[model samples]
Structure formats: structure tokens, C-alpha cells
Target: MDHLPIFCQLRDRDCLIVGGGDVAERKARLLLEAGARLTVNALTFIPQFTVWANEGMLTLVEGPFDETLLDSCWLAIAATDDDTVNQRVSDAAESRRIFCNVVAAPKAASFIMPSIIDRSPLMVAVSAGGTSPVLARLLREKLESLLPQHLGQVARYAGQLRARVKKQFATMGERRRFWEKFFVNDRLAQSLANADEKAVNATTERLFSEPLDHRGEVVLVGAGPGDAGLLTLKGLQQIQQADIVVYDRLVSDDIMNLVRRDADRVFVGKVPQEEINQILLREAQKGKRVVRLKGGDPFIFGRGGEELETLCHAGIPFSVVPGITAASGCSAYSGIPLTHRDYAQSVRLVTGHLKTGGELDWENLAAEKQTLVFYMGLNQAATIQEKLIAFGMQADMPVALVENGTSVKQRVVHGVLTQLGELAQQVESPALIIVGRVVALRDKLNWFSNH
Candidate 1:
């Protein structure tokens, strides 16, 4: 917030750069790209600058720095290493009420340059307000990786369809919703990415002919287990654009903060699954985007398949975004490898609660040389311990309980299967119980607190 960020239209406008070094050359090139009529004032010039001048791409004046150079320029850049010259240019710019950028000296300049990611019609800029140029470049690079290369082409194509879509859809909201869906359409993006004209044309034609206010869809997004950073990028995008968000008690407050501020939130905690389904269906049937935001990966004991089945039977369109499940996230953060070459060879995810029609396979779960992760099994720890022992498992099997996994309050307690009942009484709910010889690996692998 130190400086007002704005894009200036430099097309065919006079712009001045003072210096003949590499820095000035760089700024001159950017000015030319912006369609600015660039003029460079320096006694000597770089080879590329000289070549550009010969090509009539820019005007080069071989002279000393003068205040008169600021007369006709719409914008100015003082890129010379000489502090005195930069100050003179800035002072002259201020007197003339013209904006100026003193390169490498952002505090003295009226304007500052931002690291840009150019996709022609689609452009992204990152600025750390002059405090960190390297950090800005790093951010620009990260964004460059995430953005599709053909985004500019897609944007241009969207511009081509704007008039047609406006004519087809009567209201602004209708047009916006259509565009939102259009942006996230996987098939459309693939077609654009591959430059498939036939497929793109076919899809575009259908878009115009289809109902503008179509039935809304549900996006089942994993909010991750406890930590918000564990959320997937696609999940973040889904929740941000959702018109209605349905969340459970397990989702962390940090994750909830990322949801769209204007979206409606429905607390489905302690509510019957059938009642939750009715709420989601009502929203989607009314053409409102619904997001079923659940903690952790939805399919693994989260009953995500059940909710998806509900949507399927109702003929509601829906998609799912997977999150880092508790077992994987908690095990890594707590420094207890779920699978190791010398220890556990495989991993099993089991639920502690035995709902109707859902029961644990204690016989298979009691096998040795494999890690067992029981989710929300604090109340059933005694049953799990006894069942495993009765099923021929060793009573001295190492066990670890990870409470509030992946959060700052995370605590991992180690014990043996014989002490599972006693240890379970010591910890709080929302814990993951890991059973195997692998639990003993935490003695050397516990690295979370050290960092």
C-alpha cells in the first residue's frame, strides 16, 4: 500500500530514459513493447540501443542530461547509475508534475516497476513494494508455472464471444455465471491448450444454444486436515467461487477464512446426513453453486462417496477435489513414516467408529509389518486393542497417537498396544492412532519440533 498500483497506457506516448548502460537499455525495450515513443539521452549507447535507433524504433540523443529533456515526455525513467543524474531527472519530473521511475531507487521515484508475467491479453504483475526485488521475481516465476501458456489466446477468444454472450444472456449475473463455468471447463481449457479449432467451435456453439440459467452443480472440496495450507489449489478455487458452502465441524477455522466472503455458509455439524443432502440439493436445484467443504480427503471415511451418491441419484452435476488425507499429512509432520523398507511394508487406513453396514476387518488389520492408521478412534481404542490382540496380533506392538495433526497444537504420544486403552484416555479427540513397529521410528525421525 506504499504506492498506488496502476497500469498506464503508453501507446504512442513520448517516454524518456536517461542512461546508456544495460539498465537503461532494459527499460527502453519495455517502453517500446508498451508502444511508447521512447527517446534515450546519453553520450554513448549500447549496441542494441544503437541498432534500434537506426531502425527508427527509438530516438537517441547523444548529449548531457538536461531539464529540457523532460518537456515533451509523458513518462520518464532515470536508470543511470549516477545518483546526481537520477536526482536531477526526478526533481525536474516533479516540477513538471510528470510521473517518473528512478530505477534501483524506488523510494525516490514517483512510480515503481513491477515484475510482470505477460500473456499478452492476460497479464499478471507482482511487486513487493521495492523491499524485495528477488522475492517479486520468485513470485512471478511461481505464477508463471501455474498459469497456462495459452491463457492469452483463451482470453482473446472470450473477448470474441463477449458480444454474442451478452446478447444471449439478458442479465449481468447470467453472463458472469456462464463465464465462470466457461473458465473452469476442463474440456474447453484442453481444447484451447491444444489449439483444437473444431472442438473449440463445437463447444462455443453449444454454449450459446444451452440454457443460460442451467441447474447448478456441487463441488465436493477437501479442506485438508486441520492446517489450511494443506488444502489443494483446486479446492481453494472451488470454495472461493461457490455461492453456497456447506462445511462440517472438523474443518479448521483457518480454512473457513479462505471461503468467499459473500457466500452463504451452512453448518452441517451434528445434522443428519439426509438433512444435509436435502440442503445441498435445494441449493443446486435453484441454480446456486454449492460447495461441500469437508475436512481431509472426502472419500476416506469422510462419507464423501455417500454424498456424491446422493447427488448422483438426484441427477445433479458435481465434481470432487482431493485433499491431503490425515494419515499421510499427520504421519509426515510427526516424523513417523507410515511405510518404511526395514519396518512397515504397507499402510492401512481404518475407521474407529463402526457405523451401521460399516465394520473394521480386524483380521486383516492385525497383520504384522504394515502400518495401521485409525481415524477418530479415540473412543474405540480399547476395542481396537483387544480385537487386534485376539486376532493373533502382538500385544506389544508400538503405537502412536497424533492429536490435532498438522496444526501448531500437534502432539504425538508413543505407547504400546498393551497400553492403548490407558494412552487413549490421556489424549483428546480428533486424533490419529498409528499401530505398527514403524511407530518406534519416531525416536530418530521426530523432526517437527527441531525445525
Candidate 2:
């Protein structure tokens, strides 16, 4: 990383601005927004800063640079015209270990500000590593188009429900897995897509529920991948009544929105913890129709087996509604046939997280008869490649990485087996990796292109 990743908090700290020109004004405004107490120095000021100072909004020092002004301060900026003097000021700050920013060159700058997108509770900052501020601004505008105005509202809503979700899944890990889905699924898009109050309230009502189990058992659901949308009709019929949805973090919001509004959505997320499953069972025992929703076939990497096992042990009247798995979904979406006569004759579904711990043995994983589809393998990319290659698999076999698999940002990268891991890095996280000759057909069968 060219610049150290850091978030500075200047709230109520003393920050000096040496020049009162346009550049100085820009620096002063940024520091002010950061809650810095600014001491502006110069014979004159920019109109905006001049107005602010005269209006008592800022403290102005009507004089040239002084060393005393630099003392008892958290940081100082040299927004002046003289390069040698700015360098001198920088040297002084460095000697005292006081933070300093020189607006002359970004590379020389100890502090570089970014073009920001402040959706209050939803913050996004863009920077071209201080090389292209204009490009950063343009990217920020592009992000504005992609980012819904209601993102802040949705973040606020999540904050509002945090206590409740915590109380519900108190014994479990942080709801980290859930938000990944909440962020990606168009369902989240719906939640944060519009600024409509009624829509937000309607979505919140559908998603969140009270702490009590009065709503009954919720069937956790899994929405399958790709064009098959391969959702079982029975599963589709039951979604409208889903009282509580304990789902995978990647479940599409579009699929989740299919549920009745009044039903509560609790993200049990992905983890092996029994506490979340117990919560599901307890809610189910309450007589509420519960759905344990998953994405790309729950049983594949989804921990559906564990969830169902928990439900069965608890004696809850639960039935699994299978959706298409990632292999099927991504293949169909990418138009790469999972099982082609000229390529892969059969396909294998495998998870990247837990092999020894899970029931699906790697014994079948070694079978040469079929292609391999790995879900949640982003972090385990290297591990998957090593193990598969160690299992006597061919080195130059075909591979495809589909990122954000079905979402609009979905990206596909293709390469040989030896280089799949490196190629996958180009694709973002929350990806699905498909290997075997089947990937060769992606050019011919590619269909889900809107993303």
C-alpha cells in the first residue's frame, strides 16, 4: 500500500492552517469537518473563510507564520505558496512529531484528503492514491449512481435492530456473515434502494421481529443460483409465510423480498454454532412458520445439513426447501454447462471451509468422474488449489471464477488450473470457483449478462 491506511480523529483538536488561499480554504474546511479547531494564518483569507471568521464560525490569526503558533497543536498544514517554506514547516512538524500536511505534492503529503461520499451512517471515500483527485471525484459520482440514497437509512435500521438481533443470537458470533448477504442481495438493494419511508418501514417490518417467539418456527431458506432460479415450487409457496428467515449471508435480497412483509428476517448467517440453530428450533417450536434460507443450494456449502440436523433433533416440523446450488446457478448464469458431453460428464459440489469437520468426505472429492464446484472458497482459494492438485488432478485444467456470482457486479475470470487462484484475485470476494472442462463452454453458453 502506497499510503498507510489510517482514520484520523481530530475532534476538538488544535489544527493550524498557514495559508488562507483557495488551497488553504480547502484544507481548512476538511479539518473543520473533522471537528478540528482551526487557527488560520495569513494577511488575507478566501471569501468563504473570511466570511466564516467574521461570522464567528472560525478563529482567524491575521499575521504571517510564527513558530509559537505551531506549539500546543495536534497538527499543522502548509498551504502556502513557497515550496521551500512549506518544506521547512514540514521539517519542523516532523522534528516535533506533530502531524503535518503539505498540499503541494500528494507524495510529499503526510495527510491526503479524499473525495468523499457521505451517506452519513454509510460512508464511502474514493482516492486514486493521491495521483488523480479528479478521477477519484468522478469515481465518487459513479458510486453515487450505484449507491442508493437509503443506504444511510438502512444502516440506521440495522443499528436500530442490532440490539434485538443481538438478544436473539446473543450466544452466537458477531452477525458478520449476515451483513455480507445484506450488502450484496438486491433485497438489501430494496431495503436501501429508495428513500421512501413507507417502503423502508415495510421492509423493516418484514425483516425484523420482536424478541419473543410468538411468531412461531421460521423455516430457514436457500435460493438457488442462476437461470434455473431452480427454486422448488413448494419452497416458493412457503416463502410467503416465512415468519423468520435464518439465512446464509449471501441469499439474494430479491429472493428474500419474495417473502410476506409481516414475516421477520433473522440472519443466522454461516457458522457451525448450535446456538443459532437452537434459536431457529425454539422459534419453530413456537408454531411460527420459519424459513432457513440459503443461497446456491443450502446443502452444498450452506450448512443446511447441520441446520436440518438441529431441527430434526429438536423435533420441529421442519422440511428443507432446496434451491439450486452455486455450481448449477453460476454455470447456468455464465452459460457454462456443468455437465457437457464434450467436457465434464458429471459435476461435484464441494465446500471450501470444512472438509474434515463436514460429513461430505473428500473421498468423493477425489473422484475423477466429475467437475468440482466450490462455494465460500474465497479465503480458501489457495487451500482448495493445493489440495486438489495434490490429489493428482491435472495441472493445466480449465477453471472459472464468478464473483458476486449473480449480482450485477458479477465478474468472471478464466485460466488454467495452475493459475486459477491468481486469476480469482481479480474477481472480488463472495465468489464461486468452477473447475473442469465445463468452463470452456462459458463463451458459447454465457447468458446471465445483465450483471
Candidate 3:
């Protein structure tokens, strides 16, 4: 590292800026946010500087840059356009033993400003040792997306509970473990994000009351339809924080790779629903952070409700993170709008896994001017076609079967409703059947596969 990176406490401290233009304005803003008492000396001034000076936000010295300005300051920034004047300010700060930053002249400066992601009490700084500011900024932006917006609130809440936690836990190891569990607690995170003080306090008290080794939670997350990019932010966070991930078979490998590397993986593909529910309860009872990972929206066809009910009855705390369902993902990737203004006025998401003696309403499903998306319906394609035709639906209605929807290996086959059976045979498993007039729009809206 070319420079030691540290967050300086500038609150109520004196800081100096040797310019009054836009560059100096930027530096002044940062200093003010840090509660620094700022002084700016320059021959010329921007309107913002004048306004700030008038508002008593900073002390404005409307004169040439002078060495005296660096005498009383703890930190100084040479933001003047003139290199000679900047160097003079840097030299003055060096003699005073005050850290100085010369804008665009890193070699002459004692410090460099790093790209920062400020979440109030929480901050992340990215620097490339003054070699690549752009690279640092790009990295900062990436981190901004990966981190939750309400992290500062969470941190503040954690701070409030630190004293109580210290009193409750005797050993440092116990304290560390408690904090580890606290930081990943979905209920506490949600309460903080919602600004519910009562909920936060209640959760904290409940957690503190329970034995530290017996505090566990289950986070039910949707993995979306094949594509990892389609996963929700909360879903990604839960999986990455999980101690054990119980995932379904349909979840794409790309999404699986993003899970915490050391987390225990339990593939519940062919496992019965009752067994899966027990697995989640059993793991959570052991104080493990359990993630029930399902493909697509769990409520849609993933049986997420069943698992949540099991957790609820077992008194195991749980949270749900919904994902992009196959109907939405497959339709978009196949260029077939589920509900269009002219073609489909509405859309229906139906499961194709027909149970014996359990029949869906064919009359409503066969209605025209609506889109129908079938999940796991490839096997019943002939029965679906025959029933729709028998219910006054046209046999020649346009239909598209999307296999491996939203994945790089995705394939879409278009045909009439009469050819549904033949089209179904042409595609592999994990396919979505889209039927409606909107299927014709695929010709114009097709973009994903065209590339």
C-alpha cells in the first residue's frame, strides 16, 4: 500500500481548503458533513462558496492563498487550479505537520481522497493508491449495489444493544458469537429497516432472553427462474449468510455458486415436502441459520407456504424473500408479453402438476384475450390442448414453450395449441408453456435469443 488508509475523526476539528471553485466546493462539502470547522482561502469564489459563507457553514477568506491559513488547521486541501499555488499550499501544510491533499497532484500531497460509500455510522472506502481513481470509484459503485441501504440503521441499533449484550455474555467468544447471530438476524434487520423501535427492542430482548446457542432462524428465498441475475437482493443476502442451504433441484447452478462457500449444502430435489419441512425445522432448532432455497417464486409453485407454515407451527422464526417467477422470467426472455394492452388483458399462472381427481376449471382457463402460463405442464400438454379445445377455445391458438427459461441454454418453440403435445416433446424439462394471442408478438419482441 502506498498510503495508510484510516478514517480520521474530523468532528469539530479545523480543516483548510485553498480554493473556492467547484473542486474546493466538493472538498468543503465532505468536510462539513464530517462536522469539520472549515476555512477556504482563494482569490476567486464560486457562488456556492459565497452562499455557504453567508449561511455560516464555513469561514471564507476572500483573498490569495496564504501559509497562515494552514497554521491553525489539522487538515488542508490544495484545490486551486494553479499548480504553483497548490504546491505552495502543500509546502505550507508540510511545514505545519498538517496532512494535505493536492488535487490532481498526488505525488506532492501527503494524503489522497478515497472513493467512499457513506451509510452514516457505516462507511466503506475504496482506493487504488492514487494510481486509478476511476477503478476505485467503479469498485465503490459495485459495493453500493451489494450492500443494503438500511445498513446504517442496523448498525445504530446494534450499537444501542452493545451494552446490554456485553452484560449478558461473560466471555468474549460468547459476545462475538451473539453479535454474529445478531447481525444476520432477519427480523432485527427488517425491524431496523422499517424504523420500528418497538419491534427492534422486542426482538433484542427476546434474543437476549434465549440461550445464545439456541437462537436460530429460517430465511425462505426464491432463486428465480434459472438466471442468477434475476435473484432478489434480499434472497442473495440470505443465501450468502446461511449456515445451511436447503435448495431445490430447479435452482440454477449459477445461483448455487453464489451461496456462502463454507455453508452446508442439502439438495432437497426429490425429497418429500414433509421431509423438507422437517429438515428446515431440525436445522433451525440446532441454532443454525437455515436458508430454504426454491426455484422461482416460492408461493407460486415452489410450495414455500408449506415450509413457512411448518416453521410457524414449530415456533421457528422465519422470513420470506420472493423471487421472479417462471411466468414473468420466461415470458420476458421469450419476448412474449404476459399481458399486453391489445393482446392479453390479463394473465394466469397455473401449475401443470395435475393431481389425480383434482381438476382445474377448464372453462375459465380456456377464455380468450388472456395469457396462460403453465409451470411443470409439459407432461399434460395433450390433455391441456384437448380440454381447451373442448371448452370452445380455438385449436389454432398461438402457443410458445420456453425450455430452461432465462438460462444461457434457453430454447423457445412456437406452434398452435393443436401442436402443444408435439411442441412439448421437442423441449426438455423445466419448460414453461405460454398460450395466448400474445405469443404472436414474440416475432417483434424477440430479443434475448436473437443475440
| C-alpha positional error of residue 214 in candidate 1 after TM-score superposition, expressed in Å | 0.8
TM-score of 2: 0.47
Model 2: how far residue 230 lies from native, Å: 4.9
**TM-score of model 3 (CA atoms):** 0.59
TM-score of 1: 0.63
lDDT of 1 at 354: 74
Tens-place lDDT per residue, model 1, 1-451, is: 4887788899988989998889988888899999998889987888999899889999899888978988998899998878998899999999998899998688897988888899888888889978888999889889999988778877888899888887888765588778977887778878988889999999888877767655688999988898888998899889888889999988988999999999899998868887887888888888878999988888888888877788778888999999889999888888899888958778988877776677688888987789999988999999998999999999778999998899888887888999999888878978999999888888888877732
lDDT of each: 0.87, 0.71, 0.87
What's the TM-score of every candidate structure? 0.63, 0.47, 0.59
The alpha-carbon lDDT assigned to residue 286 of candidate 3 equals 76
Relative to the true structure, candidate 2 has a C-alpha RMSD (angstroms) of 12.4
Q: What is the per-residue lDDT of model 3 for residues 397-451, given as tens digits with 9 covering 90 to 100?
A: 9999999999999999999999998999889898889999999999999999753
Whose TM-score is higher: candidate 1's or candidate 2's?
Answer: 1
For candidate 2, the 10 contiguous residues with the lowest summed lDDT are 209-218
Clashing pairs in 1: none
Per TM-score, what order, best first?
Answer: 1, 3, 2
Candidate 1, after superposition: displacement of residue 212 in Å?
A: 6.4
